[PDB]
Amino acid sequence: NGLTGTGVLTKSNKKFLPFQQFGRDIVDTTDAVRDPQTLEILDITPCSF
Amino acid sequence: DLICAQKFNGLTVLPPLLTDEMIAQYTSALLAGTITSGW
Numbered sequence: 365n366g367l368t369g370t371g372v373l374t375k376s377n378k379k380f381l382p383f384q385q386f387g388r389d390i391v392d393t394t395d396a397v398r399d400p401q402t403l404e405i406l407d408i409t410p411c412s413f
Numbered sequence: 414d415l416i417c418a419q420k421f422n423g424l425t426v427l428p429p430l431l432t433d434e435m436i437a438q439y440t441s442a443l444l445a446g447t448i449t450s451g452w
């Protein structure tokens with residue numbers, strides 16, 4: 365949905381609630397997403413550096 | 414976590430050269446030399 369980035373999408377274990385779209389960590393960075401077409405919660409992790 | 418959040422933004426912590434088990438062996442030498450030989 366325009367949220368651009370680079371990372372390793374997995375299946376997120378976070379207990380998202382029907383009103384919650386994204387997730388954020390302790391540093392206010394997008395830590396999870398919601399699939400626009402499948403409604404599956406994906407955990408985003410940056411690629412190794 | 415927060416230690417992982419810092420790492421992902423370019424902030425990382427290097428490990429010390431002497432491990433805590435190597436400093437603890439230096440201390441034992443000072444303790445063992447003091448008792449058995451003095452100054």
Ligand SMILES: *[C@@H]1O[C@H](CO)[C@@H](O)[C@H](O)[C@H]1NC(C)=O
Pocket residue numbers: 400401402403
């Ligand atoms: C269309 O998107 C909806 C959510 O907007 C989803 O529930 C549904 O499965 C999608 N249908 C497809 C991909 O055929």
